[PDB]
Amino acid sequence: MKAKELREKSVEELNTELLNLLREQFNLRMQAASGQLQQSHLLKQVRRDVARVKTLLNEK
Amino acid sequence: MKRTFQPSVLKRNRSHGFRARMATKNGRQVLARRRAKGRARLTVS
Amino acid sequence: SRVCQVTGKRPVTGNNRSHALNATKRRFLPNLHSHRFWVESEKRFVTLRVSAKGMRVIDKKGIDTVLAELRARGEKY
């Protein structure tokens, strides 16, 4: 996914960060503690996918 | 019948604390010793 | 500190030998005096803490020549 995310606009790449934070991380974090979430692996890969983006948009 | 240790955390820290040790040339060497020995509790804090 | 500004004479140590050669530690302090020197270059008095031998170096050389050497080391006066 990195090779695909690298070719993106600086304004457009924030929307993926905000989409990763808005739902996904928050939603899975709230859903995990309530005991509704079976798939625990999603918490890990989302956190890594944020890091990827937040690394990628540090171009200056 | 009244023993020697009559605790007070203000007194404790003002007397033996990290900043109390940092303040002085000799107090900095104490820390340098405890670090050199490799102590977990460097001061009482 | 008891240090001549001109020569750099500071207090050396040594013994104080008795008739029976009992070595007791002492110090030899230099003959320091705060003295005002007229600097004729810029028309003013300059106060310097100098040894009696300092004064003789200032007499031998020029006060300005000594102040030139003082300014090179990074001193005040």
């Binding site: 905000l18 934070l21 928050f26 709230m30 503690a33 | - | -």
Partner: protein
């Protein structure tokens, strides 16, 4: 007002008797917040993420319990809870 960071404040909803009794009778929600997380930040976060009308947020810091097991001592992390009172327009 503090976009992106508001998402990191609310950790989880708290589950207990005291938490439950305060749902129906007091109209509040108890929840685990970040160790930072001011009452304004918790309010503003609930106002956006949960999207409900917040009356007032009360907050406290819970101290971690020293669980000694086997032969080693180990203390839990200090976590902050927030009793968030809701207005009459309520749900969850």
């Amino acid at each position: 007002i503090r976009e992106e960071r508001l998402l990191k404040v609310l950790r989880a909803p708290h589950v207990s008797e005291k938490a439950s009794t305060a749902m129906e009778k007091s109209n509040t929600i108890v929840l685990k917040v970040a160790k930072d997380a001011t009452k304004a930040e918790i309010k503003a976060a609930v106002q956006k993420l949960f999207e409900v009308e917040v009356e007032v947020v009360n907050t406290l810091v819970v101290k971690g319990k020293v669980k000694r097991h086997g032969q080693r001592i180990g203390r839990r992390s200090d976590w902050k809870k927030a009793y968030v009172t809701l207005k009459e327009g309520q749900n969850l």
